Each structure stands twice: as C-alpha cells, then as structure tokens.
C-alpha cells in the first residue's frame, strides 16, 4: 500500500537525497512541492506541498545540513531530518551501542509518526553504507528494532558494499561483516551495490577520469529508481514488497540480488541512441555492466527477473530473450525453472538534467540472484580474516563496549552463509 524510506549514514543520505531527486523529476515535483498511484512514496500535505515518506538520520550534521541548504530545503518537514551532534567515528561499536542508543528512540518515533498516516503500510526501504560508522552500527540497531515494533512489513536493504579505491578505510571489513551478521535475520531482501562496479561503469561509459561522489550516486539512483518504480507508478512483476522475496529469494537468508542497469551513455552521445530492444537486454547480460564485482558465468543462477522501462511491447522481449539464451552461458541451478519474470513500465526513463547520463527511449534492469554474489562475500571475508588474525583494530570496539565473542561468532556466521551459498549452488 505505502512505503517509507529510511536513510542512515553519510552514504545512505547522499544516495537518498540524490535519488529522491530522480523521484521528483519523474512525478514532476518542483522542490517547493506542487505537481500541478504515485502517492506510493509520498503523502500529500496541507494543500500544495508533496513531501516524501522519508527519514534521514545521521549522527553528524554536515550531510543532512546540506539537504537543509540546497534547494529541496523546501521539500521536507524539518522533522524527517534527524541529526545527531557526535559522530559515529567509523565503527559498528559506536553506532550500535554507544552514541547510537541515544538517538534511536527519537528516530523510531518520527518513523511511526509517518507510517501512522498511511492506512496499510507495507514496509521499509533502508539505505546505508555497508562499512563505516553509523551506516553499519546504527542501521543494525535500527533494523533490530523495526523488526519488533512492525512484525510483518518486510524490509529491503540497499547496501553500499565498499570497494578499495572509492574511499574506504582500513577498519571497514570489520564493520560490514559485523553489521551484516547482526542485520541479516531482520532483513527480507537486500540489494548489494558494490562501488568499484559503479565507479568502473563511470570511467567506462560515462567517461569520467575522476568519478565524483555525486557522480556515482546519479548512477545508482537510477538503478534504485528502476528497482522501486514497479510499486510507484504501479504495474506488476512486483507491485508490493512481499512480491520481492517471492520472486527473488528462495531461502530465508536475505538473499542478495545483484542488479544491472541497462544503457548508460553520456550526453555527448545523447543523439546516437534509440538502442536495440534486444541489445539493452543483451548488454545487460554482461560481467562488464554489473553492480557487484563478481561474474555470474562462474556461478549458477537461481532467480532471473528483468525490469524494463519505456516504449517496449512484449513481442520483443520475448524472442529477444530466446536469443539472450542461445548465444549465452545460461546457468540455471538444477531446480529453479528457467526464470525471467519481466515487467515493462512504459514510463520514460527520466534522468537528471544537470546529469551526464542522457535522455533514453527505453532501459533494462535485471535483478538476478546468483551463487556468484558469494564471491563478494569472501573478497570481504579475506580482508577481515587476516586483520582479525592479529586482532588488528579490535580494541577500538571492545572499548566502546563490544565483546570479543561478537566478532568471533559473527565471522563464524558468514562462514555458514559462504558455505550456505556455494552449497545450494550447482548440483547433481
């Protein structure tokens, strides 16, 4: 019925702010408010404003202050913007225990205050940084608690899995592994988004030597538009959240779909296009055009699912999937039919005007869940291991109140998931 967006953590927020903009630019909301089946995310105010169903929560100011600064300043109730004095200083310890505890009851209030006006809320979309301070720490604690005050209502995490170059920090592995252990039973489905792969795309097709922070976001927001949307403008493949895990995740364990946005190409080239209804599909089936830095050609597939947008009638998709089959490494794991639940949406795939991506006459999306997302689970777990094999940074947490046997036993769970994954995988 209705949908809340919780943004937590520097990343989370900046993705939020710069994706919530692509929301407006699609339903036509002037910052102000008035836009002279779309209320899926927003609730209509007094008589003029259009206001999101949003919470932005960080433990610094900075991030949220610039939302209270740059136009859009006009878009929110100042209440939906929760800022919190002392910073999470880059550790799950902080967020989840010390400085988190302090703000969690206040957030959790305005959260309610929002789904309260909303007759039949159907769940949450939580955006957060995989590693790093409040993005990992608070998130978890947020999640723990939501799964309490709202039993049913499912939860979709959009996590920004941190790549070496696009500024991490030493302690990250710890933080991602930490949260993602204590997160995963409270989450239903989870869109992992590896930065490398977004960053790569940006050097690749967008052709930016530098890939800018907000450069990466405009990209991802688009994925995020296309992943939502089906429930925003309405029109199936998943019109509701509990339809996400129906189609994408077979086994309790939160399964992490990888996505694959279709035609990114740079204005400069905005006039080469109208791109092959086949090809968009066929280039989306590309290691090089991914989302997470793996490859699904060295790991079996267990639920494919394309999300289309724009001028596309099925008779194309169809004998264009057949062909996306015959000259391809298919890979369907023993028992999951040979999926592809597809959804066209008609809706011009509107992109940002001060952007780098250009106007498009149709775009794809692909939400596939595969035993190769499992690569990213040890690419991380290695970093972890040999840091932990010398306790590396341990105490900066144990100080702020954690136990050793947290760390020990959380990695002793990824141990299972990593074995869980590759296990269900390819059979006899």
């Amino acid at each position: 019925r209705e949908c809340i967006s919780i943004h937590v953590g520097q990343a989370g927020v900046q993705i939020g702010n710069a994706c919530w903009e692509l929301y407006c630019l699609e339903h036509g909301i002037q910052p102000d408010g008035q836009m002279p089946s779309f209320n899926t995310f927003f609730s209509e105010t007094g008589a003029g404003k259009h206001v999101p169903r949003a919470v932005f929560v960080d433990l610094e100011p900075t991030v949220i202050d610039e939302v209270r600064t740059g136009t859009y300043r006009q878009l929110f109730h100042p209440e939906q913007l929760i800022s919190g004095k002392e910073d999470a200083a880059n550790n799950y310890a902080r967020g989840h225990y010390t400085i988190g505890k302090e703000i969690i009851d206040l957030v959790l209030d305005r959260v309610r205050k929002l789904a309260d006006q909303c007759t039949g809320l159907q769940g949450f979309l939580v955006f957060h940084s995989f590693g790093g301070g409040t993005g990992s720490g608070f998130t978890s604690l947020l999640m723990e608690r939501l799964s309490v005050d709202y039993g049913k209502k499912s939860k979709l995490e959009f996590s920004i899995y941190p790549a070496p170059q696009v500024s991490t920090a030493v302690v990250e592995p710890y933080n991602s592994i930490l949260t993602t252990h204590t997160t995963l039973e409270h989450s239903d489905c989870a869109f992992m988004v590896d930065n490398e792969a977004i960053y790569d795309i940006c050097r690749r097709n967008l052709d930016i030597e530098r890939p800018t922070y907000t450069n990466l976001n405009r990209l991802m927001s688009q994925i995020v538009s296309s992943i939502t949307a089906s429930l925003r403008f309405d029109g199936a493949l998943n019109v509701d959240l509990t339809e996400f895990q129906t189609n994408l995740v077979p086994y309790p364990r939160i399964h992490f779909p990888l996505a694959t946005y279709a035609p990114v190409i740079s204005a400069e080239k905005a006039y080469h296009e109208q791109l092959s209804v086949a090809e968009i599909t066929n280039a989306c089936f590309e290691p090089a055009n991914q989302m997470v830095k793996c490859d699904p050609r060295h790991g079996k597939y267990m639920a494919c699912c394309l999300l289309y947008r724009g001028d596309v009638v099925p008779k194309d998709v169809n004998a264009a999937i057949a062909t996306i089959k015959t000259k391809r490494t298919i890979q369907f794991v023993d028992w999951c039919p040979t999926g592809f639940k597809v959804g066209i949406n008609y809706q011009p795939p509107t992109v940002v005007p001060g952007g780098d991506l250009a106007k498009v006459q149709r775009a794809v999306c692909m939400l596939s869940n595969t035993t190769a997302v499992a690569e990213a689970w040890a690419r991380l777990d290695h970093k972890f291991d040999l840091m932990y094999a010398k306790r590396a940074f341990v105490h900066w947490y144990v100080g702020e109140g954690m136990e050793e046997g947290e760390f020990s036993e959380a990695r002793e769970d990824m141990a299972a998931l990593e074995k869980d994954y590759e296990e269900v995988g390819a059979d006899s």
Binding site: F233, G235, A322, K341, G401
Partner: protein, 121 residues
C-alpha cells in the same frame, strides 16, 4: 525457444508475465544486551578513572615526601650543629677553667708555704 509464457497482470501503466524456458527439473525484551554495553564501558572507564585517580594522589604525595625528605634535613645535621657547638663550651670550659685551677695552686702552695718565714732566726 518454443517457450510459452503464461501472462501475469495488466495495469493502467504496466504488464508482467513469466517466460519459463526449460522445465524446473525476533522478540526483544533483549535490549539487556544493550545496557550491558555500558555496564562494560562505564566499568572499563570507571576503572581508568580509578587506575588514574591513583596516578593522581601519588603526585600530590611524591612532592610531599621531599617536603618530608627535607623538613627532615633541618631535622638532623641542622641541629647536630647546636649540640656539637655545645660539645664545644663543654670541651673548653673544661680545658680553660682547668688551666685556671692549676695556675691557682701555685697560690695555695706559694702562700701557705711562704708563711713559712714563720720560722725566722
């Protein structure tokens, strides 16, 4: 492929449909785990306030036991002075008023044996 694709839903702005290609073939009374956080913090730090409340009143002691190690220097050999410089008056008024008490017996022996002229012719 020879695929079929049974058709699922139609909206004012959409459509969905399966295209299957080849046979298939919480509860939280448990935030005691969270007070505990601080039961460990405000310990592990209310015990670096009392492993350091200590670093403290030894400072206000060390510099107090030199004021103690020097009060007690006026104590000893800063008075050894007075009852050694007395074991002077002692030692002299002995050797003096005893150089007077022999150079005074050539008085008795020179007067009570000069009144010897009590003899006389």
């Amino acid at each position: 492929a020879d695929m079929e694709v049974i058709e699922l839903n139609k909206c004012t702005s959409g459509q969905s449909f399966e295209v299957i290609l080849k046979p298939p073939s919480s509860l939280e009374e448990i935030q005691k785990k969270l007070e505990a956080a601080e039961e460990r913090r405000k310990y592990q730090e209310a015990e670096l306030l009392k492993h350091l409340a200590e670093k403290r009143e030894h400072e206000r002691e060390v510099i107090q036991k030199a004021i103690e190690e020097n009060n007690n220097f006026i104590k000893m050999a800063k008075e050894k002075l007075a009852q050694k410089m007395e074991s002077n008056k002692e030692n002299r008024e002995a050797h003096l008023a005893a150089m007077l008490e022999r150079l005074q017996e050539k008085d008795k022996h020179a007067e009570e044996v000069r009144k010897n002229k009590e003899l006389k012719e």
